[PDB]
Design a binder for these strands. Structure first.
Length: 1209
RNA sequence: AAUUUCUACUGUUUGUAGAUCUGAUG
């Protein structure tokens, strides 16, 4: 009842796609006229015309450049040098970014408003690229493309004259090349941001004539290049617009690349013969399928082998890495963690080290902050090959982390460069096609390309997109041409990923236009002779009938009487009622019988927003009754059932256009005799298809498909009254040829017995008929992609409401329940439903999902046992690479079931679903569901609750297809998902997983041993450490005011006590190499090392007696036994057992063990991660209940506000 | 191991339960 008035709010369109079975002998008539082959060869020539148009774009780029005349190069020379203050970095980089913008305005200037090249362009719009003026190519590329009427060309361009609209999606991609914006696809990006910083960099190394000792030998470069390849194109700043074209850049890179070039001259005369000069970097040139097996075997025979790509250059360069200065070698912040994982330790060592030696210059005193911001993002990147830290306070002492780029290529070059022993099984035998096997001798080919991306990552640590002054130009000068060659492995490896991990079928379908350019662009109308397509009904099914070019006059005089007749749709429609009504406003005396000078001029200046800043009645009165009486005059919009409201009732012009939006769309059904229709389909005058999906079959008996329930709702008898759904124009009829053979796929024959895949079901069924795998792809079939529109006739909109409608409905409703969904470490997903008081209603894992209700039987499928079977499927080394996508295909398909489970949970409890915030709660551990996968779940949960209908519900209930729920905001804003989308809420997932859910206890202090000089000061901040002889456990009193990481919340005092058994988390060493989870017994181990190290513990208290012992293992193991106690979640080797045990007790005095017992409390450690998510949503409910003005309520959660709320509840 | 298409299937002897966009190189 919370979602009662949330039906029919905003309109959203969708596309419903079916098959088309050819009814009658119409497939033979289609094969007679050669429609399929015509559209097949046309979609074959589409690639060639696209390549011709790409060549035309290339020629247009080369003709457009050379007319720019940019004159800010000296100002960029002054401003850009000297690389603009990287310690300062704010206030001058902004003005440099403005200078880059005012420079890249000139690249898009000489065509827009310039008029040399005519701002409409006449050719980017694909309407008049074909058939204007009877020929257009006298100025255009056809004088190149003529070749005296070339036989491969011209004929291939003859098809795309009437069908010019195939390029309406292709021109959208080419429209981004000439963009003013700084998106990196543009032309002006690669000239001003790519090439221009590299041009000033390449010049300034060469402009050191008298700064270095190059005053003498500069001329002997210029005398040898006086024969050819003049350096004067590359030695002056004003000679940059010489090479704005593509033909200028290639002449420039011929000089720098060589073949004799300037790079080899300075290496032979100055380097080879203490100090070695740098090398210059070549500029960037400015603007596949891989289907056959012959291509990718010939591709990886020479495009990646030792002919083209050279790993001998990274060999000798990284062998002498120690000789170059490690001050000038730079490391970006993005690759700190990947550097620290591949070598020199763990994923968080260099983040610990860099912040460890930069936080000594900041002192948090006043505690708004203004110091913890500027210290963080600025100094975090050292940008040198680091000295591995001093760490003289004994922070995990180890050897150097700087000799590792030396050592990676020097790591037994047989092993680490494995291409040498993977060059023996090679060859290109004569082969058209082969089918992929699980393990042929191609596993060595993917492991050849496995080390390919590893070398690409080994050089990716020095990404360093600088633009920095003192960087080592000797190292980076060779590394600039080397890494840009080496960065094209990721594109090659992703394509052999796509080919070798293929399905046996193919999904390539070409659009059939039936010789008609405007086929199905509008439905049944006066203009049904243009669009050829009518819809028929035979009281069980819906038929798509297509006209013919010969006989377009069959349905003008059709028999209306008969038994068992086909109905025919009418579909009269007015498109754009606020747009088409001023398309009748412009008439001389056609509709303007009474054209007043008052009303016409008041429509011009005062037509926008109903008046020119006024709200009057009289001009709003004279406009409607002109339009109302104007509708009745012309015969086009006449005979419409326009039941208009009077002018006195409504004065808003938005209300008048709201009344003609439902009444503008009328669908009727007059019938036509069947034996008239059936007798002409066998002649060939009209084609009959049947719109067919699997629930239109006669054998079907289950619940119907979801999108079929929309298409059956298009032509219901309750769509005579005000329509909710709407049939849209511009449909399309695809055709998919046979991509599979019968004998190729494994089939199950007649009388064969089959075993059930799921571990629960043991039964076996006989199946007397044959079952063919991929029966859809065995035989070729048509398609039809019908677009529909829901809530047509409603005018409302998106987030302009500021979610006032959702928030107001929550406050008037009483006793709302909260739903929290979070990831699990041992569960796939976990759910917990919480009332307003804060107690669990139900808590159930999503490992097992039971919605499978065929006819009252429920089938529970284990998705955890399937993922166990998928994980061993990926374990096999000698196998293909495509089993990693089968798990991603499953997780994309598993979450589609989960979206159903939540939408039935929301209806049962009138609940609110609260998910984690991926923007600032994304820092998480390892999980069974990834982070890029979980965004697809959080996106598909929005698109479902846009138009939520329940299939089993009757049509009277709220939630059927008649009354569809509109629970979330419209998905036009798909990127910005912040803190609210309708009923969905988004809370930060930090500090939710490990909290004692009874008392709200989180470990705010972190016991970590760094130095024993201040480990004495750590234990001295404890209030009282004693031993309870009567109770039986130790007593670590604390006070969070004395420690650091100060917390504003309540309960600054605590009482850490010991227990019976704490199954310790995985902590292992090379020697410890074991099952790696060694469970500890803390309370007797605290009785240990006290009698061992000769310290009495009977005296209350014994907090200062810890501080007089410096055994170096007493203070170290007291950290190990306190890190066990303060960690709250515990995971053992037994995978079924995962739990939470808390040190601190309640007010009553019992401790929380999640295993014993489960009384309306979180069952395990995965339930607690979902219980504290829904507690964060309970606080967002308590803000709305405490909001007297709901306009600007901020639902954000501070970290101390949640801690103060969780433990004072 | 059957589907407009995806996922899990066997879920009355040519099928069952969810989900499903639309246009398109990284």
């Amino acid at each position: 009842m919370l979602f009662q008035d949330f039906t029919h709010l905003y309109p959203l369109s969708k596309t419903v796609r079916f098959e088309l079975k050819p009814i009658g002998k119409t497939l033979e008539h289609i094969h007679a006229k050669n429609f399929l082959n015509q559209d097949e060869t046309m979609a074959d020539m589409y690639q060639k015309v696209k390549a011709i148009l790409d060549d035309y774009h290339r020629d247009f780029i080369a003709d457009m450049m050379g007319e720019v005349k940019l004159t800010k190069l000296a100002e960029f020379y002054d401003v850009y040098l000297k690389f603009r203050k990287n310690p300062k970095d704010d206030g001058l980089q902004k003005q440099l970014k403005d200078l880059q913008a005012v420079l890249r305005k000139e690249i898009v200037k000489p065509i827009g408003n310039g008029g040399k090249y005519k701002a409409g362009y006449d050719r980017l719009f694909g309407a008049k690229l074909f058939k204007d003026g009877k020929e257009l190519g006298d100025l255009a590329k056809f004088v190149i493309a003529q070749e005296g009427e070339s036989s491969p060309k011209l004929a291939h361009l003859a098809h795309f004259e009437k069908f010019s609209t195939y390029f309406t999606g292709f021109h959208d991609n080419r429209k981004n090349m000439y963009s003013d914006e700084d998106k990196h696809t543009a032309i002006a990006y690669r000239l001003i941001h790519e090439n221009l910083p590299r041009f000033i960099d390449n010049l300034q190394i060469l402009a050191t004539i008298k700064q270095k000792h190059s005053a003498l030998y500069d001329q002997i470069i210029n005398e040898l290049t006086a024969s050819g390849l003049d350096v004067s194109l590359a030695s002056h700043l004003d000679g940059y617009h010489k090479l704005l074209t593509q033909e200028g850049i290639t002449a420039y890179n011929t000089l720098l690349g060589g073949i004799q070039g300037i790079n080899e001259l300075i290496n032979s005369h100055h380097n080879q013969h203490s100090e070695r000069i740098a090398k210059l970097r070549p500029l960037h040139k400015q603007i596949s399928k891989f289907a056959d097996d012959s291509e990718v075997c010939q591709a990886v025979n020479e495009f990646y082998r030792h002919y083209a790509d050279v790993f001998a250059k990274v060999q000798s360069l990284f062998d002498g890495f120690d000789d170059y200065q490690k001050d000038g070698i730079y490391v970006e912040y993005k690759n700190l963690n990947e550097l620290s994982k591949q070598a020199f330790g763990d994923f968080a060592l260099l983040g610990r080290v860099l912040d460890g030696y930069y936080v000594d210059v900041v002192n948090p005193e006043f505690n708004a902050s203004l110091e913890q911001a500027i210290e963080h993002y600025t100094a975090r990147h050292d940008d040198e090959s680091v000295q591995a830290g001093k760490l003289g306070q004994y922070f995990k002492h180890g050897l150097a982390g700087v000799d590792n780029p030396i050592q990676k290529i020097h790591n037994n070059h047989s092993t680490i460069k494995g291409f040498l022993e993977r060059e023996r099984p090679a060859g290109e035998r004569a082969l058209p096609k082969i089918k992929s096997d699980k393990s042929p001798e191609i596993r060595q080919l993917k492991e050849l390309l496995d080390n390919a991306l590893n070398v690409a990552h080994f050089a990716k640590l020095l990404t360093t997109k600088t633009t920095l002054h003192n960087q080592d130009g000797n190292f980076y000068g060779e590394f600039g041409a080397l890494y840009d060659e080496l960065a094209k492995i990721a594109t090659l490896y992703n394509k052999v990923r796509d080919y070798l991990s293929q399905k046996p079928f193919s999904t390539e379908k070409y659009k059939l236009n039936f010789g008609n350019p405007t086929l199905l662009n509008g439905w049944d109308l006066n203009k049904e002779k243009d669009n050829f397509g009518v819809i028929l009904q035979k009281d069980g099914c819906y038929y798509l009938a297509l006209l013919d070019k010969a006989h377009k006059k069959v349905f003008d005089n059709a028999p209306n009487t008969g038994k068992s007749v086909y109905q025919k749709m009418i579909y009269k429609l007015l498109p754009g009622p606020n747009k088409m009504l001023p398309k009748v406003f412009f008439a001389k005396s056609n509709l303007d019988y009474y054209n007043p000078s008052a009303e016409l001029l008041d429509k011009y200046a005062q037509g926008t927003h109903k008046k020119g800043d006024n709200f009057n009645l009289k001009d709003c009165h004279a406009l409607i009754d002109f339009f109302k009486a104007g509708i009745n005059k012309h015969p086009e919009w006449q005979h419409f059932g326009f039941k208009f409201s009077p002018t006195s009732s409504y004065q808003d012009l938005s209300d008048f256009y709201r009344e003609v939006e439902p009444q503008g769309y009328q669908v009727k059904f007059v019938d036509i005799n069947a034996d008239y229709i059936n007798e002409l389909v066998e002649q060939g005058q009209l084609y009959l298809f049947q719109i067919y999906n699997k629930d239109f079959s006669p054998k079907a008996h289950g619940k119907p498909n979801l999108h079929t329930l929309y298409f059956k709702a298009l032509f219901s008898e309750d769509n005579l009254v005000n329509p909710i759904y709407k049939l849209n124009g511009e449909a399309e009829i695809f055709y998919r040829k046979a991509s599979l053979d019968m004998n190729e796929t494994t089939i199950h024959r007649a009388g064969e017995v089959l075993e059930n895949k799921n571990p629960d079901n043991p039964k076996k069924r006989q199946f007397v008929y044959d079952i063919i795998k991929d029966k859809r792809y065995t035989q070729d079939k048509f398609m039809l992609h019908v677009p529909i529109t829901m809530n047509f006739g409603v005018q409302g909109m998106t987030i302009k409401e500021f979610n006032k409608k959702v928030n107001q409905s929550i406050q008037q409703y009483d006793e709302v329940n909260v739903i929290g969904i979070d990831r699990g470490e041992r569960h796939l997903l976990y759910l917990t439903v919480i009332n307003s008081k804060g107690e669990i209603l139900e808590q159930r894992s999503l490992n097992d999902i039971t919605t499978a209700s065929a006819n009252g039987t429920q089938m529970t499928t284990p998705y955890h046992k399937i993922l166990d079977k998928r994980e061993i499927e990926r374990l096999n080394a000698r196998v293909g690479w495509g089993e990693i996508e089968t798990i991603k295909e499953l997780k994309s398909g598993y979450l589609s079931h989960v979206v159903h489970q939540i939408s039935q949970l929301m209806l049962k409890y009138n609940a609110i679903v609260v998910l984690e915030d991926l923007n600032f709660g994304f820092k998480r551990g390892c999980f069974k569901v990834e982070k890029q996968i979980y965004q697809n779940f959080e996106n598909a949960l929005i698109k479902k609750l846009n138009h939520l209908v329940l299939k089993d519900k009757a049509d009277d209930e709220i939630g059927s297809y008649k009354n569809a729920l509109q629970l979330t905001n419209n998905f036009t804003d798909l990127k910005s998902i912040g803190k609210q989308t309708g009923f969905l809420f988004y809370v930060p997932a930090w500090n939710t997983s490990k909290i004692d859910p009874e008392t709200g206890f989180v470990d705010l202090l972190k016991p970590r041993y760094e130095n024993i000089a201040q480990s004495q000061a750590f234990f001295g901040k404890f209030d009282k450490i004693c031993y309870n002889a009567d109770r039986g456990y130790f007593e670590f009193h604390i006070d969070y005011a004395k420690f650091n990481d100060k917390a504003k919340n309540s309960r600054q005092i605590w009482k850490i006590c010991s227990h019976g058994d704490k199954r310790y988390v995985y902590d292992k060493t090379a020697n410890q190499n074991k099952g790696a989870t060694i469970g500890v017994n803390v309370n007797d181990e605290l009785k240990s090392l006290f009698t061992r190290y000769h310290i009495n513990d009977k005296q209350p208290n014994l907090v200062m007696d810890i501080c007089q012992n410096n055994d170096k293992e007493f203070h170290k193991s007291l950290m190990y036994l306190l890190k066990t106690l303060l960690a709250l979640r515990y995971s053992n080797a037994s995978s079924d057992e995962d739990f939470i045990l808390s040190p601190v007790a309640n007010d009553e005095g019992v401790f929380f063990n999640s295993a014993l017992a489960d009384d309306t409390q979180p069952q395990n450690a995965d339930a607690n991660g979902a219980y504290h998510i829904a507690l964060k949503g309970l606080w967002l409910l308590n803000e709305l209940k405490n909001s007297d003005d709901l306009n600007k309520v901020k639902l954000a959660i501070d970290n101390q506000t949640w801690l103060n709320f969780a433990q004072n509840r």
